[PDB]
Structures are given as C-alpha cells and as structure tokens.
C-alpha cells in the first residue's frame, strides 16, 4: 500500500522545559537577548516554520498540529457565539417578532456608565445590537430555543478540547511521517468526498429533517414554543407528511428513481421567499443534495491504492503545448515539497471565494429575515470582502516566499514557471500600461465630472443626462438572466435573484431585494474596481516575479525574502524586497476594497434598501447614486459627509461606542504615519538621547533599547494603517446602518 | 516654405502669434467663451448669511 498510515511514535517529549527558554526554536534567538530586537524577532520568527529547521517532515508536523490549534480556537469562537447566543440574547423574543426586535447578543456590565451601550433593542431586553447575523443562521437552522444554543455551546467546548488534543496527539504522541502528507491524491479524494461531499450531504439531511418542517411552521405562523421539537420530526413520519405530503411515500421514491415525487421539499423555486425575504429553504435543500452528489462523484477522481483514478503527476505532465516548452512538467514536485507553493494557491482562491460569498449573499439572501436586516447585510458583505482581500495579498506574499526559499532553478527548466520569469519584463510592463490606461480612463472621468460641474457645464459631464457611458454588457446580462426562466432554464419558477429584474419583496414594510439598474455612475465605478485590482495585481506580481533577481539587484534571492534594502547605492534600493511589494499591496488592497464597500453601501442605500409603503417606495438616501456618483465631490458630500451624521452625533446613545472608535481609528490611522514616513536611524538616535537620561539615573536596562527594524517599522506602519483605516469604516458603516436601517 | 530647424521655429512661433492675437477679439466664439458675452441678469449679491 503506497497510500498508508505512517506515523512516528513520540517524536517530542511533552514538557514545559522549552517554555522556560524563549526563542528555543531558532539558533539566533536561543542565546537570550542583548537588545530589544530579540523580543520582536521572537514573535516574528515564531511561526516561520520553514526557517526553524530544514527537515520538511518536521515542518509538516508543525503545520499539521498548528492547524488543529487554529481549528481549536475557531471551536472556542463558535461556542462563544452560541453561548452568548444562549445566555445573553433575545433570540427567544426575536423569533416571535423578527421585524421590530433588533438582534442583540452582547450585553455589557454597568460600571463606568458603559451600560448606555445596552440599547433598547426590543423584546424586553437591553444589549448591544449585533450585526453578525447569527440569529438568521439559527432560524435557518430552526433552533427555536435557548436550550439548543446552550447544548451546542457545550458541544463547542468539547470539540475544541478534542481539537487541542488532536494537535497534541498528532505532534507530541503520534506524529505523521513525511510521505503521509505527500499523498495529495488521497487528500483530495478524502476532502472532496468526505469533507465537502459528505458535509453537504449531512447538512442537507439537517435541512430536510429539521429546518424545513420547523421553518414551514414558522412561515405558516406558529409560536416557537408550540412547534414540534426536531427529534419528534424524526421519530414521527406522520408529522412530516402533514407539512410535506411526500414523506408518506418514505425513501421509496429515491431508490425507485421517482425523484419527481420529492418535489414538495426539494424544489427549484428561485427568487426569494416572500414571507421572510430569504431564499427558499427547500431550494437550499435541493442545493446541498446536488452539491453533495457532485462532490462525492468528484471525490473518486484520483488514484490511491487501486489502479482506477487519475494521477496528478501524469495529468500535469501531459498537458503541454507548442507555446510553453515542457508545459506543466515539474509543478507536481514543487506543489508537494513546498508548503508556500500550496499556501499561495490556497489563499488566492480561498480569498477569492470570500468575495464570491459576499456578492452572492446580498443578491440571494440565504437566511430568513436576513435581507431586511440592513445592518447584517452591510456587515456580512463588508467583512467577507476584507477577509477575501487580505487572503489575496497573502497569496502574493507566500508565492514570493516560494520564489525566494523553495524555488529550485534546477528542476524548473523551460516549464511554465521558468518561462514566466524569462518574460517577466513583458508581464509587468503590459500590466504597467493597463494600470496607467485604467488610471486615466477611470479616475480622469471623475476629474472631468468634477471640473465640468465646477465650471458650470453639467451637460459636459459623464452622467445620465450628459455624455452617457452605459454599461451595455452588464445591462445586457440583466436582460438575459431575468428572461432565463423563459427558455434557457425552463424549470425555474422565478429568476436566480431579484437583482436581474422583476418586482421587489416587501417584508415588514422594508425592501428585502428590488432590481438594480446600472448607469453611467455604475460604469465609472466598476472601472475604478478594475483599476485598483490591476494595480494591486501589478505590485504583488512584481514582487513574485522579481523576488529573485532584476536588472537592479541580480542577487536578490541571496538577500532573502524579508530584507529592507541593498543600501543607498545605485540611486537607492529602498523597498526592493519581495516583502516590500506585499507591504505596498496592502495599501492598494485597502484602496481597492474601500471603494468596493463604498460602492456597496451607497448603491444599496440609494437604489435597493429603504422602506416600502406601496405608494412609491422610498430609499434610504433618496435615490441619489447615479445623480451624484459622477463627481468626487458627490462622494464627498452625499456619502462621506451626509451619511457621517449618524456616527458623529450618536453620543448619549448605544451607538456612541461607534462614535468613539470613529475617533479611535482616525487616531490609529494617523498614528501609523509616524511609522510609514519616518525611518529607523532617526529613532535610534533619539533612543540614545533618552538612554543617556536613563544611564544618568542608573535605570539603564539590560535588554538594550533599539529602534524598530526597517522592515518592522514598515510592518508596524501598515498594521496601524489598516487597523485605523478599516475600523474607521467599520464604525462609520454600523453607526449609519443601525440607526437608519 | 520651411525646411530647416530655424525656419520651422519661426513658423510655429508666428502661427502662435496669428492665432492668439486674433483669439482675443475675433475667435472668441459666441458659444465657446461665455466670458466674451454681455452682462447677464444678476449675481452681485452679498456673500450670504451674515457679514
């Protein structure tokens, strides 16, 4: 059996002896400090497992049990939210009136006057109005009681200690060998089939047998203490046949292939559930069934111990063409003896999945009473774009680390990876052009509209009453996908969302989802998005391809991944390393994603969100997006100034914490400019002047004060730039959208 | 007319002469330059609000 369990018994003694000696992992740190750069290099090099040792087996065991540590912390984090969902919440009261009672699950302690953050969220309850949307998960899960939240919180603590056991066991007691990890055929067969396939089979079975009969009784209208408990929905088939009359046929229509007889509770409805605003749950049930059958089929693709199935070395080495030399030869060997090469491809798509998730959830809101909660909708979009955006920059960072550390010029000869480096000047320069092309022809349209509107020439702007730049292609797709149930998807009862066209869903006198009409302001801002992503690509891909060498510095890989510079010579070589390109890319990721979440938070408030009266529905900001997003001054006036009037005068209320962090993150943002502008050799000399006054009063420390390193003072700078930048928009968005929505 | 460098330097400069010295009087189009118009209705009010 080439695919087999292979571990090593007791590699590391479970002992506190190495906790006594910090910096024990590295040669350069184990000799103790003499300098405050020791304790920063301790935390910097702590999880740099490739730099501790050279053994790939010892690296692999370290990242395998650290992943149990991250999963074990997520299980604490989930079990916190079910516990704070249970003991300090209004989820009992929220289910009876989920239109007026604001979701709240954080309650503060009345000490310094901070009990004013316990707002009047309704439901006989005081607490911080949450926006993470767990109450919409739980109605979609059919929880209906705070007993169920408490039992799955205890189930979360149990699972977290099991995950902490597992990382302890699979590192200290019985840790795997190297060729266990290098069975990537067996890993994908198990993860596509068992994790993704059987997971969505199991969750569909939760949706068939628990969530569908509970949420059918909630939509038909039953108080949640009167609904049958979901174990009674298992043991009694006669209850299920009352709601969906095809459970009386049992599981006979499945094996007799009479699957059309399951049409009551596996549907293809589409659109939205008009009672609750969310997606249809029977639609999501047939979703996760058909997802599961797809992944279990795809989970039997790769060859492990019997000759059937594909082998990824042969799949890669066969796809070779006349333009690319050897083709994909040698990519299997570098995606199996390098974690950073795995981590780059993983963080790319997993970050790109998060932005797929964010865009597919305002438009197709999967949870009951999710869409009318405008606070949850704004946060669940905004969060999952940022979490995507960091992970995409992490793809650029750890691809560069592959090029510096784990790249092998020997085994990479005239494959794709060798030929990308050999025309890396053509790659960056044609990308340099299209960023400059997108720079003028997207942002200069805004400067044109600023100038024409300031010069009293509104007929010469780029707007709808002026030179019209319509998004012809995206308006064409909305005319097709709304007409898709006509003949291209004839079994759909409605469209796949309501952005494509049609009518709105009114739930509780508020718009769940209405159609989105794209205009010239939507044209300009989508090309702003194309601009900022191509520049973010430009910086990160320059760091990947010029990680090893350039015409500037030929021996750059010998200097490593994270170095400051090569000195002031040849004009200056500040920020030439591949660390420094993923330093600069974080600002453009910040610059790209801020305009994404600004274009979300103002298109929805102008053209989607708002109260409906069946009398000419009014939106939140009155319908002023295409009227005003032509100009930078429109983004200044109508978005950053008009909508800031709920974060600046929110004092004396529960939203006053958002007013503090609005000033708090305006501080921390600007605090970063002390680090982003200045440099070390100033601050080291200033320390010498104050070590002098500490020498004079005999309080000279033994761990000697040094200024922060060159790369560290940059890394402190971009960390406080992003923390002060994002938490500004966090508190701006939430203090806006909790009040007006 | 012009074939060398200093002949072309004269012709570009004299063509810049011939446009601009006319543009102030004959070349200010009725639709292009609203400053070269007549004094229209109002505008000469105080700066607003208070003093």
């Amino acid at each position: 059996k080439k695919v087999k369990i292979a571990v090593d018994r007791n590699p590391v003694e479970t002992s506190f002896e190495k906790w006594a000696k910090p910096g024990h992992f590295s040669r350069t740190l184990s000799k103790g400090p003499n300098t405050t750069t020791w304790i920063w290099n301790l935390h910097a090099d702590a999880h740099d497992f490739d730099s501790h040792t050279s053994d790939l087996e010892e690296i692999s065991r370290k990242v395998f049990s650290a992943h149990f540590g991250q999963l074990g912390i997520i299980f604490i984090w989930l079990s916190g939210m079910y516990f704070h969902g249970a003991r300090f919440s209004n989820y009992e009261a929220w289910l009876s009136d989920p239109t007026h009672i604001k979701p709240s699950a954080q309650v503060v302690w009345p000490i310094v006057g901070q009990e004013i953050l316990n707002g009047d969220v309704g439901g006989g309850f005081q607490g911080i109005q949450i926006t993470s949307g767990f109450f919409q998960l739980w109605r979609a899960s059919g929880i209906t009681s705070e007993l169920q939240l408490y039992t799955t919180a205890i189930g979360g603590l149990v699972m977290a200690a099991a995950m902490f056991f597992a990382g302890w066991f699979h590192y200290h007691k019985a840790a795997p060998k190297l060729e266990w990890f290098q069975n990537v055929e067996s890993m994908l067969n198990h993860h596509l089939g068992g994790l993704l396939g059987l997971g969505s089979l199991a969750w569909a079975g939760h949706q068939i047998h628990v969530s569908l009969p509970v949420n059918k009784l909630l939509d038909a209208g039953v108080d949640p203490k009167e609904i049958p408990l979901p174990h009674d929905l298992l043991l009694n088939r006669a209850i299920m046949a009352d709601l969906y009359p095809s459970f009386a046929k049992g599981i006979a229509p499945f094996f007799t292939l009479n699957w059309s007889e399951y049409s009551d509770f596996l549907t293809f409805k589409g659109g939205l559930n008009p009672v609750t605003g969310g997606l249809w749950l029977s639609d999501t049930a047939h979703h996760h069934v058909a997802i599961a059958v797809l992944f279990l089929v795809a989970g039997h693709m790769y060859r492990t111990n019997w000759g059937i199935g594909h082998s990824m070395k042969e799949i890669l080495e066969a796809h070779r063409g006349p333009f690319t030399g050897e083709g994909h030869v040698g990519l299997y060997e570098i995606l199996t003896t390098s974690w950073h090469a795995q981590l780059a491809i993983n963080l790319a798509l997993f970050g790109s999945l998060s932005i797929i998730v964010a865009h597919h959830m305002y438009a197709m809101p999967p949870y009951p009473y999710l869409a009318t909660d405008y606070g949850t909708q704004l946060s669940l979009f905004t969060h999952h774009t940022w979490i995507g955006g960091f992970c995409i920059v992490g793809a650029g960072a750890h691809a560069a680390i592959f090029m510096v550390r784990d790249y092998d010029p020997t085994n990479n000869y005239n494959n794709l990876l060798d030929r990308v480096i050999r025309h890396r000047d053509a790659i960056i320069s044609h990308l340099n052009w299209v960023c400059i092309f997108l720079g003028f022809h997207s942002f200069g349209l805004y400067i044109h509209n600023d100038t024409m509107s300031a010069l009293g020439r509104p007929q010469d702007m780029f707007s709808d009453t002026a030179i019209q730049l319509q998004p012809v292609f995206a308006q064409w797709i909305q005319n097709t996908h709304f007409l898709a149930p006509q003949l291209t998807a004839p079994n759909a009862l409605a469209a796949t969302s309501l952005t494509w066209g049609g009518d709105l869903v009114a739930v509780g006198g508020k718009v769940a989802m209405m159609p989105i009409s794209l205009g010239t302001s939507d044209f300009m801002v989508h090309h702003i998005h194309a601009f900022t992503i191509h520049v973010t690509v430009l910086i990160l891909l320059k760091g990947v391809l010029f990680a090893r060498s350039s015409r500037l510095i030929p021996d750059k890989a010998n200097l490593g991944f994270r170095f400051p510079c090569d000195g002031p010579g040849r004009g200056g070589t500040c920020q030439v390393s591949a660390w420094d390109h993923v330093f600069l890319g974080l600002f453009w990721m910040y610059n790209s994603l801020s305009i994404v979440i600004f274009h979300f938070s103002w298109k929805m408030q102008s053209d989607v969100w708002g109260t409906v009266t069946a009398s000419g529905v009014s939106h939140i900001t009155g319908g002023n997006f295409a009227q005003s997003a032509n100009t930078i001054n429109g983004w200044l006036r109508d978005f950053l100034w008009a909508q800031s009037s709920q974060v600046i005068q929110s004092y004396g209320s529960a939203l006053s914490a958002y007013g503090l962090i609005f000033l708090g993150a305006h501080f921390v943002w600007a605090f970063s400019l002390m680090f982003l502008f200045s440099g070390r050799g100033y601050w080291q000399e200033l320390i010498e002047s104050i070590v002098w006054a500490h020498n004079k009063l005999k309080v000279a420390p033994a761990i000697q004060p040094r200024a922060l390193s060159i790369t560290q003072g940059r890394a402190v700078g971009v960390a406080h730039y992003l923390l002060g930048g994002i938490a500004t928009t966090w508190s701006f968005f939430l203090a806006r959208i909790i009040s007006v929505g | 007319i012009i074939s060398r460098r200093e002949s072309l330097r004269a012709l570009v400069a004299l063509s810049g002469i011939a446009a601009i010295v006319t543009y102030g009087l004959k070349g200010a189009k009725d639709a292009d330059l609203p400053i070269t118009k007549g004094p229209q209705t109002t505008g000469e009010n105080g700066k607003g609000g208070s003093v």
């Binding site: - | 292009d32 609203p34 400053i35 229209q40």
Partner: protein, 144 residues
C-alpha cells in the same frame, strides 16, 4: 551635459537626476565648483536684489490689478457691505453658469473677492482713488 553649470559632478551624470539636482542645489552657493568666499558673498548679495525686485514687482502687481480690475473707489464709500475685488477672471474653460456665479461685488465680469485685505491697509494709509493706486504701481515698478 551642460545644464548644471555650477556642479560639474552633476554635468557628468547621464541620468535624469541631473535635471532634478540642477534645480535644487542651484542656490546652494557654498558647494558650487570653484566657489570662493569673495565669490560667495557677491552672488548672495545680488540675489537679495533679486528677492527685493520680485517683492516690489509683486506689490506693484497688487496695486495694478486693484486699480484696474478692482472696486476700490466703490469700496471707499461703503466699506462694510461691498465686498473687495482682487482681480477679474478670464478663464475660457468657464461655462455660462460659472460666469454669472462669479460676478459679484457689483462688478461687470467675473471677479475674485480679495481675502488678502490689501484694501483695508490701503484705505487707512490714504488711498482713496484708483488714480492714487496706479501711481503707486508705476512707482514700485520703477523701484523694482
């Protein structure tokens, strides 16, 4: 090769920072090539004439555009409600709403309200008529 006449070490520079450092250390007289201390003080002393001749040409410019395009003779009589005028506007990029929105202060064409406040300084040192302001402009233009 010729533009930094002061620094021949910049004249041997084949790159484009030759232009940038020809500008920025052109007034760093202590580091020019062949500079002596008698040659140092003479270029500083003539440059102070260059600063003075700019200031008086600048101030004679303020006296001219107020005397010609300003409303100083109208502002003398009512110095509270009439707003001051710096210099009239000729921007051919304007539109017609941007002509009539900048006509203010009782003037004919578009104007700029002078916030520098040289009317209040001139009104209290005896200036009353525009003919007293042209004479001051021609005087400083001679002195410049």
């Amino acid at each position: 090769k010729l533009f930094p006449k002061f620094s021949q070490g910049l004249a041997q520079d084949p790159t484009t920072r030759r232009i940038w450092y020809g500008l920025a250390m052109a007034h760093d007289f202590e580091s020019h090539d062949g500079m002596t201390e008698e040659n140092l003080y003479q270029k500083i002393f003539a440059s102070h004439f260059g600063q003075l001749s700019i200031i008086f040409l600048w101030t004679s410019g303020n006296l001219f555009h107020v005397a010609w395009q300003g409303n100083f003779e109208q502002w003398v009589t009512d110095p509270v409600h009439i707003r001051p005028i710096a210099h009239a506007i000729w921007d051919p990029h304007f539109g017609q709403p941007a002509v009539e929105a900048f006509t203010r202060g009782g003037a004919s064409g578009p104007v700029n309200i002078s916030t520098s406040g040289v009317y209040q300084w001139w009104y209290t040192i005896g200036m009353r008529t525009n003919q007293d302001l042209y004479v001051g402009s021609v005087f400083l233009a001679l002195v410049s």
